[PDB]
Amino acid sequence: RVTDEDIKERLDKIGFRIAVMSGKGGVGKSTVTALLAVHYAKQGKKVGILDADFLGPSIPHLFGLEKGKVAVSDEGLEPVLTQRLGIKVMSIQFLLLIAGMIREFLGRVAWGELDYLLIDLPPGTGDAPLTVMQDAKPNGAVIVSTPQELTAAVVEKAITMAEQTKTAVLGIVENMAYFECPNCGERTYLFGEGKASELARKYKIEFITEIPIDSDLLKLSDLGRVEEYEPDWFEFFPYLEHH
Amino acid sequence: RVTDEDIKERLDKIGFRIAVMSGKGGVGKSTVTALLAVHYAKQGKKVGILDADFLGPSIPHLFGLEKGKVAVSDEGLEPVLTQRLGIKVMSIQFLLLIAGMIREFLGRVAWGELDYLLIDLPPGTGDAPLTVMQDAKPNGAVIVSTPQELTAAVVEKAITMAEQTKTAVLGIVENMAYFECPNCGERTYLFGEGKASELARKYKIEFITEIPIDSDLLKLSDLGRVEEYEPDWFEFFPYLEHH
Ligand SMILES: Nc1ncnc2c1ncn2[C@@H]1O[C@H](COP(=O)(O)OP(=O)(O)O)[C@@H](O)[C@H]1O
Ligand SMILES: Nc1ncnc2c1ncn2[C@@H]1O[C@H](COP(=O)(O)OP(=O)(O)O)[C@@H](O)[C@H]1O
Ligand SMILES: [Zn+2]
């Protein structure tokens, strides 16, 4: 119902809008989203996450927000805040077609004044995540995918979408690329790993990162305490002017 | 189109029909299917695989069968054989609603005389994999799922389906449960691992196995040479009368 100009006055308080996509599911898009929200929060920045993954909403579960309950004030629908860092989260999970539901998350929700709003788009490069791009129109987007699945095609299907909304591709994250034995510190690289840096150099992308399969990030993700995850794989993410 | 009694004379040559299900995708259902077909083939047994995963058919790709091409003889639709071990494979992939397509794979295809016919059901415990059970009616089925997702509920949704077709639950496979550093041999167990043996003991299941995240099985799976994968995680699978 929210007017297309009603969003304007709402997002005018959001300094930068980042979108997190993936060639598919399992790649770990939502977990990465979480870590980029935690990265920016721990730095003192005000972060907001807009869970746009209707298929499989894992954002609320990563921050122990199973207490799905949306309250409404003058500002509108109050997004539940994570306890530890206080990051604002809005997911349809808190409500026990889609083109308009994101329009509402952008106009009715009270994101207040925050520097970043990470949008956790649905998996894939199809229309589903396309519609969200249309109404959101992020300033930057991050491509998330596993090593064994980081084709130049997919990476290009991404650079493609970012065109229909004119959104800069901020970087590429190669999730679950290697493994480090805590016993000796050895690193065993999975087949196809290393394809991130090459694609990035090829398509002129600035940021690149390789998050290994960390048994700890899996432990805390399930317990809903992903905010206590100490290792920061984004402690090199370039400045993004959020004025 | 095949009559429901036409299958009878067809499956009368198949000694045992095993079904491989999963609480969802990514769990590695199709890869496990492949290894159980390779396990039985390397032992001299005649194996047949019926790729029933329309959503994401990975069986043909695991055996380098991208040469999708179904030939038809007196016997009917000739299933393409894997080069190394000669396992018969039938997938809709070789053809560039579903309730009847499996009926055809059971009546038109020429499985000849084989001891085992592994069926790679679609992911999940919904209706999709249910319909396949109705027409197939396996003698045994194997539950495949990741450690972090092996709830007693899901394990029971399985024991449930096996009832509507009266099919014995042969065992539970905990895929990607741990990791072994080839440097020192250390084992790092992922969060939630070990839930297989417990569920099994609880529900009275005989076979149980834990296949670790093996960078090698990932290498050969992509190259379409999963038949060269030397480690046998089924070298303890109980005998199964297939006369
Ligand atoms: N680096 C990692 N190490 C270990 N487990 C991981 C890692 N990245 C993701 N996971 C786990 O993989 C599963 C899928 O990731 P998820 O973020 O849910 O994917 P997506 O958003 O595409 O559906 C979850 O159990 C998640 O916690
Ligand atoms: N033990 C393992 N070690 C490494 N990679 C694995 C393992 N099991 C599965 N994989 C990989 O995980 C992905 C998903 O498995 P898949 O069998 O395709 O799942 P599903 O049958 O449920 O669709 C594939 O890339 C597969 O090769
Ligand atoms: Zn080691």
* Domain coordinates in residue numbering, chain B: 1-226
Contact A206, A27 (CB under 8 A): no
Q: Is B56 on the interface with A (CB under 8 A)?
A: no
Closest atom, ligand 2, to C-alpha of B175: 1
Residues with CB under 5 A from ligand 3 (ion): A 181, 183-184, 186; B 181, 183-184, 186
Angstrom distances, CA of residue B58 to CA of A86, B62, B93, B110, B133: 42, 6, 9, 21, 20
Closest atom, ligand 1, to C-alpha of A34: 17
Which chain A positions have a beta carbon within 8 Å of B218's beta carbon? Answer: 148, 190-191
Distance A90 CA to ligand 3 centre (A): 41
3-state helix, strand, coil in chain B (%, to 5): 30, 25, 45
SS3 B156: helix
Distance B183 CA to ligand 3 centre (A): 5
Closest atom, ligand 2, to C-alpha of B27: 22
Q: Is B81 on the interface with A (CB under 8 A)?
A: no
Please list the alpha-helical segments (H only) found in chain A. Answer: 6-11, 29-42, 59-62, 98-107, 128-136, 152-164, 195-203, 215-222
Tell me which residue of A223, A222, A217, A241 sits closest to A38, measured CA to CA. Answer: A217
Contact A70, A100 (CB under 8 A): no
Any atom of ligand 1 within 6 Å of the Cβ of A85 = no
Contact B189, B178 (CB under 8 A): yes
Q: How far is it, in rounded angstroms, from Cα A55 to Cα A118?
A: 18
Q: How far is it, in rounded angstroms, from Cα A163 to Cα A158?
A: 9
SS3 B30: helix
Maximum separation of any 2 CA atoms in chain A, in Å:
58
Q: How far is it, in rounded angstroms, from Cα B156 to Cα A50?
A: 34
Any atom of ligand 1 within 6 Å of the Cβ of A144 = no
Dihedral angle computed from the Cα positions of residues B228, B149, A90 and A42, in that order, rounded to the nearest 10 degrees:
-80
Any atom of ligand 2 within 6 Å of the Cβ of B217 = yes
* Residues in Cβ contact with B154 at an 8 Å cutoff, skipping those fewer than 6 apart: B23, B125, B145
Token pair 């493609």 is found at: A160
Tell me which residue of A162, A139, A30 sits closest to A89, measured CA to CA. Answer: A30
Dump the DSSP string for A155-205.
Answer: HHHHHHHHHHTT-EEEEEEEES-EEE-TTT--EEEPTTTTHHHHHHHHHT-
Q: How far is it, in rounded angstroms, from Cα B194 to Cα B49?
A: 29
DSSP 8-state symbol, A107: H
Q: How far is it, in rounded angstroms, from Cα A171 to Cα A18?
A: 11
- What pairs with residue A88 in β-bridges? A48, A81
Q: How far is it, in rounded angstroms, from Cα A124 to Cα A182?
A: 33
Tell me which residue of A218, A234, A177 sits closest to A62, measured CA to CA. Answer: A218
Backbone angles phi, psi at B209, to 5 degrees: -155, 150
Type and span of the H or E element at B41: helix B29-41
Q: Is A219 on the interface with B (CB under 8 A)?
A: yes
Backbone angles phi, psi at B228, to 5 degrees: -95, -5
Domain A1-226 coded CATH 3.40.50.300:
yes
Q: How far is it, in rounded angstroms, from Cα B19 to Cα B119?
A: 5
Going by alpha carbons, the residue nearest to atom 18 of ligand 2 is B28
Distance A28 CA to ligand 1 centre (A): 4
Method: X-ray
Q: Is A26 on the interface with B (CB under 8 A)?
A: yes
Dump the DSSP string for B191-207.
Answer: TTTTHHHHHHHHHT-SE
Contact B212, B178 (CB under 8 A): yes
Q: How far is it, in rounded angstroms, from Cα A112 to Cα A13?
A: 7
Angstrom distances, CA of residue A62 to CA of A224, B22, B37: 4, 23, 37
